[PDB]
Each structure stands twice: as structure tokens, then as C-alpha cells.
Amino acid sequence: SLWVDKYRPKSLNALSHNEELTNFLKSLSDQPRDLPHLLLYGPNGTGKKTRCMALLESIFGPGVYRLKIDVRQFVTASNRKLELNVVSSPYHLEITPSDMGNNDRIVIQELLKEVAQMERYKCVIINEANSLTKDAQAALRRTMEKYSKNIRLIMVCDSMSPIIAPIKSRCLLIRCPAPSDSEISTILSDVVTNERIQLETKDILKRIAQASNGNLRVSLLMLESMALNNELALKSSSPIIKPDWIIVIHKLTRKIVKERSVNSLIECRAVLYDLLAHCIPANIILKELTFSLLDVETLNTTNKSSIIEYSSVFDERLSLGNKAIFHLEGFIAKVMCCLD
Amino acid sequence: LAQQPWVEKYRPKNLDEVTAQDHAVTVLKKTLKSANLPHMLFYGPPGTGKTSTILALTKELYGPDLMKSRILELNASDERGISIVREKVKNFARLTVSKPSKHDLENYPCPPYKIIILDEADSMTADAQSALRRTMETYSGVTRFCLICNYVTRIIDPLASRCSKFRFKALDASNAIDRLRFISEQENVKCDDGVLERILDISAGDLRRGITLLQSASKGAQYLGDGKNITSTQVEELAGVVPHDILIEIVEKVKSGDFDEIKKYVNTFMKSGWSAASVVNQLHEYYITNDNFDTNFKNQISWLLFTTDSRLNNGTNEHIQLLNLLVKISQL
Amino acid sequence: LSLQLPWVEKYRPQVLSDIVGNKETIDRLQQIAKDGNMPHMIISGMPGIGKTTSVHCLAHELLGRSYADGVLELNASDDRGIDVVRNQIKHFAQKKLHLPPGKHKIVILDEADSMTAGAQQALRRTMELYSNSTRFAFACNQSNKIIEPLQSRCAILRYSKLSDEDVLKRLLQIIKLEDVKYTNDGLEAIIFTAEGDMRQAINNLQSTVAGHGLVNADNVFKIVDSPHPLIVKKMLLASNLEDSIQILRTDLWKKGYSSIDIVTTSFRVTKNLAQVKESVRLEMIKEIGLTHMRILEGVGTYLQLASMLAKIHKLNNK
Amino acid sequence: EKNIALKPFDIAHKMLDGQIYSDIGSRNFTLNDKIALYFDDFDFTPLMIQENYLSTRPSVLKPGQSHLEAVAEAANCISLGDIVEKKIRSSEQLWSLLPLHAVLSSVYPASKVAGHMAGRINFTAWLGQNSKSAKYYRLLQEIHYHTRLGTSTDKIGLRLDYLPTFRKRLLDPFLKQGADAISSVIEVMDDYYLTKEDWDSIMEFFVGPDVTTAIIKKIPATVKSGFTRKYNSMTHPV
Amino acid sequence: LPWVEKYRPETLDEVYGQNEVITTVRKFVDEGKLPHLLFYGPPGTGKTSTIVALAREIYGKNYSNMVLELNASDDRGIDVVRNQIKDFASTRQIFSKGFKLIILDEADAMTNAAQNALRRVIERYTKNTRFCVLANYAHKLTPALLSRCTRFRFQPLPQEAIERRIANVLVHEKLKLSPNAEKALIELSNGDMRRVLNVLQSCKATLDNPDEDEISDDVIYECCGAPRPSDLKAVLKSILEDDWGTAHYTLNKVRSAKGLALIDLIEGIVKILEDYELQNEETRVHLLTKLADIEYSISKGGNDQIQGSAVIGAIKASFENE
Numbered sequence A: 001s002l003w004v005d006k007y008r009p010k011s012l013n014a015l016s017h018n019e020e021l022t023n024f025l026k027s028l029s030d031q032p033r034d035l036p037h038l039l040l041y042g043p044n045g046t047g048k049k050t051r052c053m054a055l056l057e058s059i060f061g062p063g064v065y066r067l068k069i070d071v072r073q074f075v076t077a078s079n080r081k082l083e084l085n086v087v088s089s090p091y092h093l094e095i096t097p098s099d100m101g102n103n104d105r106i107v108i109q110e111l112l113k114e115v116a117q118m119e120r121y122k123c124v125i126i127n128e129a130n131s132l133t134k135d136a137q138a139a140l141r142r143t144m145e146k147y148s149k150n151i152r153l154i155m156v157c158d159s160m161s162p163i164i165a166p167i168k169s170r171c172l173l174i175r176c177p178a179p180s181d182s183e184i185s186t187i188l189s190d191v192v193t194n195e196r197i198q199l200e201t202k203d204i205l206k207r208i209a210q211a212s213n214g215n216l217r218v219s220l221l222m223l224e225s226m227a228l229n230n231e232l233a234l235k236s237s238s239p240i241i242k243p244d245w246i247i248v249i250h251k252l253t254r255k256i257v258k259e260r261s262v263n264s265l266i267e268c269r270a271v272l273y274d275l276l277a278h279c280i281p282a283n284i285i286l287k288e289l290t291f292s293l294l295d296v297e298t299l300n301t302t303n304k305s306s307i308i309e310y311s312s313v314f315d316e317r318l319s320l321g322n323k324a325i326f327h328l329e330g331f332i333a334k335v336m337c338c339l340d
Numbered sequence B: 001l002a003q004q005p006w007v008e009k010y011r012p013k014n015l016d017e018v019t020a021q022d023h024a025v026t027v028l029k030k031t032l033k034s035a036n037l038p039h040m041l042f043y044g045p046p047g048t049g050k051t052s053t054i055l056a057l058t059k060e061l062y063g064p065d066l067m068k069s070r071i072l073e074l075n076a077s078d079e080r081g082i083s084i085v086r087e088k089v090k091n092f093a094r095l096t097v098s099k100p101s102k103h104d105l106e107n108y109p110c111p112p113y114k115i116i117i118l119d120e121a122d123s124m125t126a127d128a129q130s131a132l133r134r135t136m137e138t139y140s141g142v143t144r145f146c147l148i149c150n151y152v153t154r155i156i157d158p159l160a161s162r163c164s165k166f167r168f169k170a171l172d173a174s175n176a177i178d179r180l181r182f183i184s185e186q187e188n189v190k191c192d193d194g195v196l197e198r199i200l201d202i203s204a205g206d207l208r209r210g211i212t213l214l215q216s217a218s219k220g221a222q223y224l225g226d227g228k229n230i231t232s233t234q235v236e237e238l239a240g241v242v243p244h245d246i247l248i249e250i251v252e253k254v255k256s257g258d259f260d261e262i263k264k265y266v267n268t269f270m271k272s273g274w275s276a277a278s279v280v281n282q283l284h285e286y287y288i289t290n291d292n293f294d295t296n297f298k299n300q301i302s303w304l305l306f307t308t309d310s311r312l313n314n315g316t317n318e319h320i321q322l323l324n325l326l327v328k329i330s331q332l
Numbered sequence C: 001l002s003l004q005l006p007w008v009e010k011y012r013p014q015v016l017s018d019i020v021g022n023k024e025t026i027d028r029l030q031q032i033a034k035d036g037n038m039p040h041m042i043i044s045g046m047p048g049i050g051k052t053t054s055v056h057c058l059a060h061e062l063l064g065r066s067y068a069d070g071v072l073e074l075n076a077s078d079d080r081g082i083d084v085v086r087n088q089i090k091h092f093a094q095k096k097l098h099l100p101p102g103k104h105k106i107v108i109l110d111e112a113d114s115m116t117a118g119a120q121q122a123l124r125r126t127m128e129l130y131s132n133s134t135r136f137a138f139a140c141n142q143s144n145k146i147i148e149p150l151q152s153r154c155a156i157l158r159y160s161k162l163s164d165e166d167v168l169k170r171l172l173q174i175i176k177l178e179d180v181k182y183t184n185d186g187l188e189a190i191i192f193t194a195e196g197d198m199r200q201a202i203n204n205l206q207s208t209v210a211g212h213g214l215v216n217a218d219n220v221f222k223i224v225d226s227p228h229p230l231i232v233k234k235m236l237l238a239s240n241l242e243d244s245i246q247i248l249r250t251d252l253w254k255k256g257y258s259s260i261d262i263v264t265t266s267f268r269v270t271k272n273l274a275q276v277k278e279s280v281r282l283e284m285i286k287e288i289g290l291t292h293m294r295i296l297e298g299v300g301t302y303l304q305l306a307s308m309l310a311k312i313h314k315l316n317n318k
Numbered sequence D: 001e002k003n004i005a006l007k008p009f010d011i012a013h014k015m016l017d018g019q020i021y022s023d024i025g026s027r028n029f030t031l032n033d034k035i036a037l038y039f040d041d042f043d044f045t046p047l048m049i050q051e052n053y054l055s056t057r058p059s060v061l062k063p064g065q066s067h068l069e070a071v072a073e074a075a076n077c078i079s080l081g082d083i084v085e086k087k088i089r090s091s092e093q094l095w096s097l098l099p100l101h102a103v104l105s106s107v108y109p110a111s112k113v114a115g116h117m118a119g120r121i122n123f124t125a126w127l128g129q130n131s132k133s134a135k136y137y138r139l140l141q142e143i144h145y146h147t148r149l150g151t152s153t154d155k156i157g158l159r160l161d162y163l164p165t166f167r168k169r170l171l172d173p174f175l176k177q178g179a180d181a182i183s184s185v186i187e188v189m190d191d192y193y194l195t196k197e198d199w200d201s202i203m204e205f206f207v208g209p210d211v212t213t214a215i216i217k218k219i220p221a222t223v224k225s226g227f228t229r230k231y232n233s234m235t236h237p238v
Numbered sequence E: 001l002p003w004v005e006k007y008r009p010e011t012l013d014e015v016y017g018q019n020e021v022i023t024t025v026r027k028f029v030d031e032g033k034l035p036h037l038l039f040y041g042p043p044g045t046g047k048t049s050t051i052v053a054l055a056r057e058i059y060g061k062n063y064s065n066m067v068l069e070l071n072a073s074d075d076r077g078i079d080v081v082r083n084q085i086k087d088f089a090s091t092r093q094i095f096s097k098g099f100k101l102i103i104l105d106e107a108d109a110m111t112n113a114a115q116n117a118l119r120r121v122i123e124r125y126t127k128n129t130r131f132c133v134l135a136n137y138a139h140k141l142t143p144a145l146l147s148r149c150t151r152f153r154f155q156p157l158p159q160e161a162i163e164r165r166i167a168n169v170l171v172h173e174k175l176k177l178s179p180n181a182e183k184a185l186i187e188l189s190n191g192d193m194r195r196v197l198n199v200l201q202s203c204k205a206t207l208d209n210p211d212e213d214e215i216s217d218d219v220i221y222e223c224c225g226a227p228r229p230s231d232l233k234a235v236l237k238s239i240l241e242d243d244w245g246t247a248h249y250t251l252n253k254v255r256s257a258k259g260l261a262l263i264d265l266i267e268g269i270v271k272i273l274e275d276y277e278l279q280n281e282e283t284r285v286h287l288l289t290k291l292a293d294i295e296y297s298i299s300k301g302g303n304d305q306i307q308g309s310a311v312i313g314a315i316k317a318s319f320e321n322e
């Protein structure tokens, strides 16, 4: 399999970065009966899910990794049928209620309840807890208050701000910072020594870390891609390999900076349509475009300030909107006007 | 040993154990001396003892044994509409009144009515409050309502007129710190100098939040197992509060005014996982109360912070909002 | 002697010729009824304009006596469930009936855009299976939400908001039918208040007849609970912001008018301010719509109206 | 018959005409007529205006205003109208905002960029792109369902990060090893419960320089036949 | 008995302010005919008072066995009131002739299906029973039920009539009301007589001596749970004159100790600032726009301290324009 998945730590002892968090998780698992509800918040691709699975393995044994995926059917009061993908083990469940959108609430009020009827306790992991609706979060607080005897919730999120205060008060907050470049370099060195990859110098690994911006999953996948491109022999001159959408967005940024006209906006529309049609989220596109524009060396302070202001405005509009291309084109047009 | 939240573990049992609410306790004692108990509207800052005082009055009314049967506690912010709360109230009222025992009758003045307590009643919509007023009118014979809230002005006049209102003063810092110190000493919680003060500052004087944070800190210290005193950084971590040194570094980066330096620092900061809303709140607290900034700077920065908070509340990208806010402040 | 009946129900369109608006759609429906062989149809438009009424009129003109049992109306958003209504449709289609050879049973489905892709596919399969017996007519707010096979098989019909000329024609026809004394300003006021809503205009006319009898502007605005357009025009066109705020506070807010009525009348009056430049009118309409959206979200206080007036004045004085 | 499909084109052409936005044109063709033009087809007019408002040569430019500033203002208004449309079509059913949406989606952006149609009135491309996005999101959901037990990521993380490396592990070995890489590709697919349909779907997600249509077409047919034969000749984990 | 019922006028001649509607209904009363009536308007205008007065005038002393008053938003459900209506319609008496009278108060709270069922029942019993529909807004009722009844609009009572009624209540109850208290009550009730009577009764209840003690404006504001003008004026003065730290402390202290929500504080501050004489229009424009923005953001949640400081900064920046 891929190196990012083959060498994923399967236990608390196999974790290599954020030593304090590993010790805290070991102490937490030392007392399974008094396990609190947990809310792990941190940047993407830092190891939150790996640490949750490692804690579950420390509590219930390796059997948590005998994962089986099923589909659960629910009926909402308008007599509408919903299907939710549930990944379950003999000891825990994993759900992503945000996949049901505004229909998440009822789904939770069903599934958790069912588990409470089936049950010392069963751990329920909730992914993307920050994107849950406020009603769903209130229902989750109700289920925490009611079924605390048999249900222990482990929520994972990238930002704790959307989480409501009553949920925060009843759960243990766990901050998961992104690993430093040294830890990423150590992990990549372990991976390349396991995979027998030739390195001219270790500095290349450092560069990969600087290219990943603290994203360990991205750094591992980038390392595997670079190794595959260079016939398992990485050199100091080996270029950093970036994903296709990032390359497209950088090309779009260069196009916007070079020329500012209506025809350029029309062609940027086609570029944005191509990006959106292939499962690239609008917020991701906007963030990448803005931070590529802010990295252009020919722009002065006023241009960058205008760009970041328009980015904030159209990010709010994207969060409040329905059609992404509208807001993205508006942002690009405003940037083009501001650059002149 | 049994497990119980310290908020409900250290609630006062009788009216005499309420520390700083002399006026409300005196008026409630006068009302209890009267044979009729009117509808009650307990209002004041959070964590001042409204629920504690109403529970103490209920116990002094019904006895420790019969208190549970005569009480319906509800939270007014319950979702699925006003219908769930109103139907629960109707079911409680229609339920037969439990007969007090001989011991309860001879030892406590048990009244015929039952008490329904609503928490966070001010969060109800106008229609929900009108429905609650209708229900209170219909079952006024056997149910007495106690509405607990922070802002009496959020309750409609028709509902507020029926209730005798009790204002709770905000707890003085000395009283809250003494209560926290007593709770810590009772539970053998080791704390460094200024840890309780930091907890009170984080909770903004809310004794409920302070007690919850102290219990969380004690649990974290037990998990650590080194036997050392709880420190301020631990309670800051548990409450999701950015450390002061990081805030000072942010302020210095804003003061320097370089766009590239600010962008680099924000990029580095977003990797640490600290909440952006906490950063905005602490920047507001630092800048508004700072005597080194003139009136115009505060006038501009208040609107800047307000706009950033409004955009953050919409569920947007934290990095972009924080960078925009910092750049706009640095241009002041 | 008989029980009284409201004019909205008494003079509701019963045949195709009674409908005034949507000239193209009504003409195509008339042609289809004339040559028989009703095809499967979808009709799209904003709610509350009478798509169901038009398809019912077509069903009447087609069937005649057999309309009582040959037409089944169902809502796809019915709480009973998609499966239950699908089974009901199947039972209705399988129910044999001796219709004339050129006629078929009619199923009118409402809110067809809310159905899932699988439900629409199942409905298409059922329609194909029972094509010789029953033809399907769907009504949706969003035409594009319907899957491609249903759009390709079904004909396209679009129902739109009635124009002022159609409303005037229908009001004149009603006035001719029931002897009512009327004046031009009264009819203009009725048309202005009812923005393409035929039912609201008919109800307002009937209420004016019941209350005052003669249809003039003063009686119409007394019957109608919305703020008087002249007051709103004076508020909007005042050269001093203090004067506008004073008018809003005295003549509109203290008179019990809700904020929704105030913003709707402001939109109506601003849309018709011929003496103001069209760009300024568009800016004012944008501000009024922003405050309307704020009011519809719950915050409908007097401060929102005051800010609307302040922004309008800022636009006017530049 | 076909004029029904021509109606949105006529509405878009009329609303982007610069004559009806001058003083005389506004007097002859009032704002009521423009909002009625919107309400003639309230499903396609905002889409057509958003599609065709960049293809005009404006005759209503203010002194000192460039074409780009006008199109930026129009796009600002269009995004505001999109927000209004989302609020209208939500569960609240705020249809009374239909006139406002008109001004925010069709009338005001056309006012900012009204002029002469430099080219042809093109049909809106948003519907086809939306259908394509829905299809590809369904494909990504299926792939994520298949590979969830092996990958520690969400669906978006699977698209953004995992798929570029899956390209190098599933398609790149063919271009360099011919049929010799079939066993390795099948092993990698089996490690993640990927079928031949999933293999076909994965290669369709790449954009820009990583497009694989021409590369796959350039692969010899013998290699592909051997790949599918070897996959069909052996059992696979389910 | 509550003061609302006990001070309801006995005859139509005692109703003030609504002379036009009174005469229009009195035409039918004199004719001895009653069509389906629908009274809509703000609460406290006297719809129930007028209808019960005309019912008494028509049916004499035997109106108890001839008319039936029910609340359409009753908690027992639409089914119970529907069964009671059908039972009253089916019941006949020896002297029962013409039309029985059934009053439904606050019918606007019923759902669409309940309104349709009520309309069907009314149409069922049109020949021998007449109904009255009392609602706050006619538009809230479904058009199908709306078109069945003759509509009558009620306009808020004039201030002089409210003052006369308040004086009559005071002299009947032997209560003494300060002029400031009367002004505060009139301002708070904004013409709602139900609110006036309820607040007066509650304030009389709160007095330690129901005869010697006088009701002040403080008692009225406490009873209504409304922000006192003195607190709002003090906050505005601190914002306008004091520095930022003092203004922030004063605003937080006042709106936390007195339990005033930030939105209510903004509304009161706007109401007070309306009376200010500003030399520049830009001040008013900035005040209105920024305060409306802050209130709209408050409606969505957000940070409370930040919004309060935003209010302070908006007021200060607007008044920087003199």
C-alpha cells in the first residue's frame, strides 16, 4: 500500500511526534472506566484520527482495527429515507453526520440512541464535528447528558470555534498542533530507511517538510510521489512535486497577475469551472488562490491588503452562498481591478 | 468514591448558605413566610446563584424527600420547537400531585403546588414566551413557575408582569475567589499562585464556569500524575485560551506593520491549532482596555474587531479572517 | 335565496378561456385540448400563480363528465411518503375506466422538484408502463431540478407572474360581471397593491365593495392594511433625513404598520419613482431589499427601517 | 416549439442592451418592464445574465470608469443575488424576496455592463458543470467508500492528497513497464478494495498537466487487454 | 377577577375611539342581523369588549345560554374546541331562535388545516349559528377562511382615551399613580389596554400598602421588565463624554447589573438619540447604519463584549462629526 498508510502508527507506542500529547493519551487510556468525552481540534493531516485510533487500541486492544463498513437507513418524519455510511468495529463506531447536511440532527438522535439500547460502553467517533449544525450539536449535548453511561464521544475538528459552548464545557479539549519540520524530517527519514530510498542528503527531506506546511499526510504523499518520479533515488536537484489542482491554481494566479482584463476574467472562469467540476471545494480554491496571490513578489503592500480584504469578503459570501463560481469570479474580478 | 460535577456537588442547601445575595434571599424569605408563593423571575449575571437559591427555596418548601417529586427542571433553549417544552410542562401539570408523608408534613410546610423551573428563559422567542404565559395562566392553580435568566429585558412584558422579579448582584471577586479556594481545599486540589485568579478571569467572574474549569484542571492534574501544582498554562490550555506571549508577539507584529512578516506569523500561528475566535476576543480585550491608544484608534479597531467576529461567526476560513484583521489593525 | 360565496372562488377560472395571463402556455393548452392526445407535461413557475388551476381547467376541458374520477391530484412533498403516493398513483393508473378513445387519465403531481433521483426514475418507469392509460402532468418551482429523461419525455410549460395589464383586464371583466361602481384611480391602487397576485386583487376588490361599495383610491387604501403609498413616497423623497425619520416614526411606525408592509410598500414606490434616475432607484431598491432580508431573518425593528432611510438619503444626496 | 428555448436568449439579449439604460431608454422601458423580463423566466434569467455579462462592450460606462470596474461591480451584485437566492430556496421558502433577487441577479449587473453584444448570447454553462460536479462527487464518494478502511482521510482529503499518488501507483508504472506492471497495479488495487471501475473513475479526476485521457489512449491495447484479463482471471477481496 | 374582564364595558355606548366600526356594527345590531364577523388589529383595541357588548345588547340577560366564548389557541387542542363548537351548534333551547353566537378569540394562531376545519364547521352550521373571528392580523389567516367573513380593522386608541380609562381605573380601584408613572405606562403599552390593566394590577399587588402607597415610574419599569430611561441616558452620557475605558466599564456595569440586553440597550439608545439636535446629517447616517449592523449581527449570535465595544465606537465615531 501507500507509504502514508503502511507506516501509520497503530498504537500509542508507535507515535513519534507531539510527545506530550502521547503521554497524555497514555495516561487517559490508563483509566478506561473514567474516560471523558474528547474533542480533538487541530490542523488537517496532523494525526488526530491516528491518535484517536491509537487510544481506542490502547483501551479495547487491537480489535478496534477490525473495521467493517455498513450502511444504516433512517426515516425522517416527512417519511424521507436517508442512508449513512457507518464504519464499526466490535468495540467502537465512526460516523460523519455532516454528510447528511441539515438532516444530521435526527440521524444522530437515532443512531446514538440505538447504541445506548444495545449496550461497559461503546466509543463513538464523530468526524468533522465543526461542520455539524447547531441543532445537531444540541442533540449531541443531549445524548452526552443522557447516555453518558454507555456512550463516550470522541469528536475531531480543525476549528473549535463553530463548536457550541455547552458541548465544550462537557468535553475535554485536546489541542493537536501540527508537527515541526524536524519531526516531519525524522518521520520521512524513517520511511525512506524502511523503503530503501537513496538520498543524496537529508536536506531534501527538510525541503519536503517546508513544502507540506506542517501537513504530515501531505509530506508523506509528496515523499512517495517524489521517490516514484526519481526511480527510488532522490537527489538534491529533485523538484518538489505538487498536486495538479495546486499547479492549476498557481498558473491561474500568474495569469491574473500578468494581465488584468475582461478576457482574462473569462478564461479564469473556465479555469475555475475545471477546478470545481473535479471535486475541488470552493473554499479550498479561494484559500489557495489568495495565498498564491499574496506570495507574488511584484505586488506592493496596498495590492496585497486589498487582495486579503476581498478574500475575507468573498469567503464570507462563499460560506453564506449556494453557487461557488459566482463568488469566485467576483473575487477574481475585484482582485483584477485592485491590481490596476 | 462517587463521581459528580462540582457545580451540583457544592450547591448551597438552604437560603442561609447564599453568600452575597442578601437582598434576593431576604425578599424570598419574606415571600416564604407568606402563605402564597407567586411566580418568580430570577434574573442576573450568570454564576451568581439563581439556580442554587431556587433549589434551596424548593427544598425548604418540600423537604429533602418530597422535593424531587414536586419539581420539574427544564432548559428553555431546548430545540425541536417550543412544543417539546410546553408538552413536558403540560404533562407535569396534569400529573397528580404527590401526597406528602406524615414526616414531611410535620417537619416542613409542604404547599399544595408544584414548581417548574426554566433555565435560560430569556433565550426563548416571543411566540414561545407567549405560549409559556398561556400555559402558566391555564395551570396557575397547581404550578408555580420560576424563570432563570441573565437579562430581564429579553422577556416580554405580558410574561414578566405575572412574575415577581429578583435581581441577583454580580459576585465580588473576593467572594468568588474564596468560594473557589474553599472548593479546592475540600477536594485537595493543589494550585500555584494566581491559578484561581486566572480561572476567574477566564470565566469572566462566572462561578459555574470557574468551578467547571477547576474540576477539569484537577482531572488533568490527576491524569498527569506527577503530584505537582496546577499551573496557569494548564487551565489556559483546558479553556482554549491563547497564551499571553503569543498575543504579545501578535501585537508586536501588528505594530511593525510589515505585510510579509504578519502573513508569515499568521501562517506559523495557524499551524499551532489555537482558536481564532479566542485570538479576536483577547485582541479586543487587550486593545480596548489599553491606555496607550487614543480615541480614534479604539473607534476604528472596535469596528474592525466587530466585522472580523461577525465574519467568523458565519463559519468561514479562520486563516483568511485572522490575516485580514491583523493587516487592517496594522494599517491603523 | 342561497348561501353567499366569495368572489375569489365564485369567479375562479373554470375553463381555459377564463385564464388571462400566460398567453403562450394557455394557447398551447387550448391547442392540446382541441386536438386531444394530451402529452406528458411539466410546468414551472413561482408558487401561488395558479399552475394547478390551469392544469385542472385543462383536465375539465378534456374529460368533461368523467373529470370526477379521471383526475388524481397528489403532492410529492406529502408527509405520507414517496412510496405511499407512488403506490396510490399505481392504483389509480391500474384502475380501468371507459374514457373516450382520444382521452386518458390525468395525474397532477405537485412539488415534483423535491423528489429524489430514484423517485423520479421510478415515476418515469411507471409513466412509461401506463402511458397508454394515464398521462402525467408535473408542477415544480425549479424546472432544472427535474432529471433529464423526464424533461425530454414531458413537454415544457412555464407559468409566470401576471402583468398589470392582465390584472386590469380580469378586474374589468369582474366589474362587468358584478355591477360595481369604480374609478380609474381605485383600479390603479388595487393593481399597485397586488403585485401580480390575482387572488389578492380579487379579495381586495370584494372587500372594498362590501365595505364602501364605490371603488376609489381612498376606499381601497382604507380596506388595504398596507401603508398608504403617498406617505411612503413622502418619506422616501424628503430632502432632509430628519424629515424622513419623522415621517417614518409618526405616520408609519406609530400607526401599527409592520416592518414587512413598510419595506414592501417602499420597494413598490421606489420601483415607480419616474422622476428619479434609474441608477439611484436601483441603489434604493438594493438597500430596501437588504433591509427586507434582514427583517425576514427575525430582526425587524424600527432601527432597521431608520438605517434604510439613512442609506437611501445618503444615496440621494451623494 | 423551439422558441421556448430561445426565450432565455431573447431575455438576456434584451436586458444587456445599452439603449434601455439611457435616460430616454429608461423612460420608454421602465424598471417595471425589466423586472417583468426577469419574471418571464425566473429560472434561467439570472444564469444567462451571469453567463453573458462579460461578453458585452459597455455603452453605459461612467466617466473615468473602465470595463473591468463595471464587470467587478456586476459580479459583486451577482454574488449578492446568489446569496438571496439561497435564502429564498431554503426551507424558509421566502418567495416574497423574488423581486429583490431579480434586481440583484439580472437588472443591476446588466445596468453596470449594458451595451453591445460583442459576440453571441451563449447558453448558461452552469447547469452542465453542476451535473458534471455531481457525477464526479458521486464517483469520489464511491471511491472513498471502497478505500475508507485503508486510508485515514476524509473524502476531500482523498481527492486533494491521495489521488495524485494513486495516479503514480496505478497509471505511471504502465507507461514504463508495459504489461509487466499489471501485477503491481492489481496488488495496489487489492490493498484498497479498488475495482476496474474504480480504476477508470480515479483517472478522470485529474486536471491541468495531469490529465490522463491522452496518456491512457496512448497505452497499447495489448497492455490494457492483459490488465483486464489478469484482473478477471483472479478473485479479489471484497 | 382580573381587571381586564371586570372593567370591560357593559354596553356599546361606553366604547371609545372606534366610533366608525362601532356604528358599522351597530347598523347590524339595530337590524337584528349578524353576519360572519372578523375583527383584526393590534391587541387591546377592544375587539372582545365590543363583541361581548353587542352580544349582551342583542341577547338580553339570557346571553349566557345563547352565546359561547372560546379561545382558538387553547391548549386542550383544536379537537376539543371543535367538539365544543359542534355541541353548542347542535344544542337547541326553547327560546333559541335565529342564530346562536360563538366567539373565537385569537383565531390567528391556528394552523392552516385547523382553519380549514373551522371554516367547514362554520359552513355546516351557517343556517342556525353565526361565528366571530378575532385575530391580530388578517393576513395571518388563510385566504380561504379570510374571504368568508366581513373584515373590520381596529386602530390603536388615542392617548386621551387611554388616559381617561386609566383615570377611571385609578378612581375605581382607589389607586394613586404618579404622572411620570402614567407616562411610562402609556409609552410602554403603546396603546395596548390589556398591557395597561395587567401592569396596573401587578403594580398594585407589589405595593406593601395597596391604598396609601403610590405607584412610581420605577415600579412600572420593574414590573414591565423594561430598560429605565435613566440608565440608558447615563450610558449614552458616559459614551459621549467620558474616555474609552470609562465608557466601556460604565456600559458593561450598567447592562450587567440591571439585566439589560445589548439589543434592548441599542433600541433605547436609538430612541433617546432621535430627540438629539445634530448639526450634521452624517452623524445620524453613521449612527443608524452602524447600530443596525450591530443589531443584525447580534441577532445571529457573535461575541457580546465585542458587539458592546462596537456600539461604543460607532456612537463615538458618529458624534466625532459634531
Ligand SMILES: Nc1nc2c(ncn2[C@@H]2O[C@H](COP(=O)(O)OP(=O)(O)O)[C@@H](O)[C@H]2O)c(=O)[nH]1
Pocket (backbone or CB within 6 Å): A004, A005, A007, A008, A009, A014, A015, A016, A017, A043, A044, A045, A046, A047, A048, A049, A050, A051, A156, A187, A216, A217, A220, D152, D153
Ligand atoms: N510515523 C508517524 N506517522 C504519523 C504520526 N502521526 C500521523 N502520522 C501520519 O500522518 C497521517 C495523519 O493523518 P490523519 O490521522 O488522518 O490526521 P488528521 O486528518 O488531521 O486527523 C497518517 O496517515 C499517518 O501515517 C506519528 O506519530 N508517527
Ligand SMILES: Nc1ncnc2c1ncn2[C@@H]1O[C@H](COP(=O)(O)OP(=O)(O)O)[C@@H](O)[C@H]1O
Pocket (backbone or CB within 6 Å): B006, B007, B008, B009, B010, B011, B012, B017, B018, B019, B020, B021, B045, B046, B047, B048, B049, B050, B051, B052, B053, B148, B179, B207, B208, B211
Ligand atoms: N452566592 C453564592 N454562594 C455560594 N456559592 C455560589 C453562589 N452563587 C453561585 N455559587 C456557586 O455556583 C455554582 C452554580 O451556579 P448557578 O447558581 O448554577 O449559576 P446561575 O446563577 O447562572 O444559575 C454552585 O456550585 C455554587 O456553589
Ligand SMILES: Nc1ncnc2c1ncn2[C@@H]1O[C@H](COP(=O)(O)OP(=O)(O)O)[C@@H](O)[C@H]1O
Pocket (backbone or CB within 6 Å): E003, E004, E005, E006, E007, E008, E009, E014, E015, E016, E017, E018, E042, E043, E044, E045, E046, E047, E048, E049, E050, E157, E165, E193, E194, E197
Ligand atoms: N376602545 C375601547 N374603549 C373602551 N375600553 C377599551 C377599548 N379598548 C380596550 N378597552 C378596555 O381594555 C380591556 C381589554 O381590552 P380587550 O377588548 O380585551 O382587547 P382585545 O381586543 O385584545 O381582546 C377591556 O376591559 C376594555 O374595557
